[PDB]
Each structure stands twice: as C-alpha cells, then as structure tokens.
C-alpha cells in the first residue's frame, strides 16, 4: 500500500448502470468510468488506459472472478501488470464516490457526465488527491 | 507551451473511425480516445475526463469550430478551462501516433484497443512522455 505502482479496480452501480472505479492506493486518487456490462473485455481495455497513463505494476480487486477472463489476463500480460497479493478502501471510496455523485447529480443529464465531474471534485477537493498521486510519482522517479 | 496547463485538442480519422487526441504540449505526453462521431458532447465529456486527472487551464485546437458548441462551452465553464490564445505540433504528434498504431495494430482485433497500446508504447518510449509530465507538474506544485 506504500507502493505507488498499487492499484485497485471494482465495479459497482447506480442507476441500473455499471461503474467501474479504479483507486491509487497510496494517494486515493479516483478514475472512473460508466461501462455498459461488467466483460471481461471492458475491464482489459479500462487497464490498458490506466496503464498508459499512469505506472501500473500490480492491481487488486475485491471480487477475485473478475480477473480470470482471458481477456483480461492478455492485457496484463501484454502491459506488465501482475495481480497484487499483498492486500488483504474500495468500501470506504466507492460510499464516498457514490455520495459526491449525489451533490452533483442534477447538474447533469446523464449519469456519464456526473460520475466525471464527482471524479473531478474528488482528486481536486484538497494537498489534493490528484497533486499527493504526482507527488508520489515524482518522487518515485 | 512552457506552462504546464496548456493542452490541445484534436480529432483525427482512421479506418472510417474518429480518435480524440489530446497532447500535454510542455511534456509531449498524449491520451487518445475513438470516438463515435465528432460532437461536442463527446469533446466536453473528454474534457471533463481530462480535467479529472491532470491540471488542465487552457486548450488548444487546430479547428476553432471544435469549441463553438454550447456543451463544450458549459464543460469549459464548469471545470475552470479557458480557451488558448498563445499558440498560432499536433501535426507531428497525430502522425506519430498512427505510425505507432500501425504497428501494434496486428496485435489487436478492434481499433480501439491498437489506439491505446499504441498510446501505452508512447508515453512509456523513453525520460518519458509519461515520466516528463509527472515531473513538470511535481515541480510546478
Ligand atoms: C466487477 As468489475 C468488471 O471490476
Ligand atoms: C488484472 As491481471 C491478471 O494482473
Ligand atoms: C475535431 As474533434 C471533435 O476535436
Ligand atoms: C474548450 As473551452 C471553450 O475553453
């Protein structure tokens, strides 16, 4: 948890809609993203996002089956991603996810454009999420 | 191009699909995105997207028309986005990107995946893109 190349990915839901919520767990910065099913194939292409943004050298997860597509095992295989077993958070954040959307929910029309903007209020909210992920990463280099 | 908060914008085409391509003009780092059509809701969502993870102040674009729309106004607004007006690059860089795509693209059945490995392989080429703009944002904090 102290290694700044830890991430961990969980899907959840709202609105009869599938969120998949991606935490840097030294940080406690957030992305997020609404995908139509919870595929194997949505979570490979959301890793190799991830992995060409930030460095991405172990996940974990709280439901272990989402890993075992094939899949999903080609993406890590091919950006150098091992499954994390050090971990034995997401609660916490994807409550805390989930009651940042509520603040912001009528200020837009689809549920896409919420989960973004409480994305946005969570890693700028304040140091902030998103500069203490930098931070980390920079030091780490 | 020296600030660390300026950005730019632009889609390019590719087997009859539409890519999003956002360059960190001060690191060269690059995000890249397909697309279903050229809108505004799909840009102000991007952007949204973008402004979520990095420091974004000013975009560029090399097509005005890009930002006329009023959701990409209300997008602009919301997040505290101002439009460039110091730049008179992403010629180079979109060039650079579907070379990369070009080569993985054997490597992955949809588009959509190529486009990310082929961000993967940029920002990691090696500093790196993807080192360089953790770097210039660490310092500016
Ligand atoms: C549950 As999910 C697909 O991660
Ligand atoms: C997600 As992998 C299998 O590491
Ligand atoms: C051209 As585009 C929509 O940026
Ligand atoms: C894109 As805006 C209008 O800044």
């Known amino acids: 948890d102290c ?5 961990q990915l969980d ?6 809609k599938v969120i998949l919520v991606a935490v840097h767990v030294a940080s406690g910065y957030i992305e997020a993203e609404v995908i139509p099913a919870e595929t194997g194939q949505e979570t490979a292409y959301f890793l190799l996002k991830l992995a060409g943004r930030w460095p991405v050298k172990t996940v974990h997860t709280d439901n272990g089956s989402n890993f075992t597509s094939t899949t999903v095992k080609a993406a890590c295989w091919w950006a150098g991603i091992k499954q994390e077993f050090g971990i034995p958070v997401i609660e916490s954040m994807n409550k805390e996810l989930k009651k ?3 603040q912001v929910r009528d200020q837009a029309e689809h549920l896409k454009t ?3 903007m409480a994305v946005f ?9 998103g500069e203490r992920i930098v931070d980390i990463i920079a030091t780490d280099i």
């Open 3 to 7: 290694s700044p190349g830890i991430w």
């Open 11 to 16: 899907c959840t839901h709202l609105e009869g």
């Open 100 to 102: 940042i959307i509520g």
């Open 114 to 116: 919420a989960v973004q």
């Open 121 to 129: 209020i969570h890693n700028k909210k304040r140091y902030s999420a």
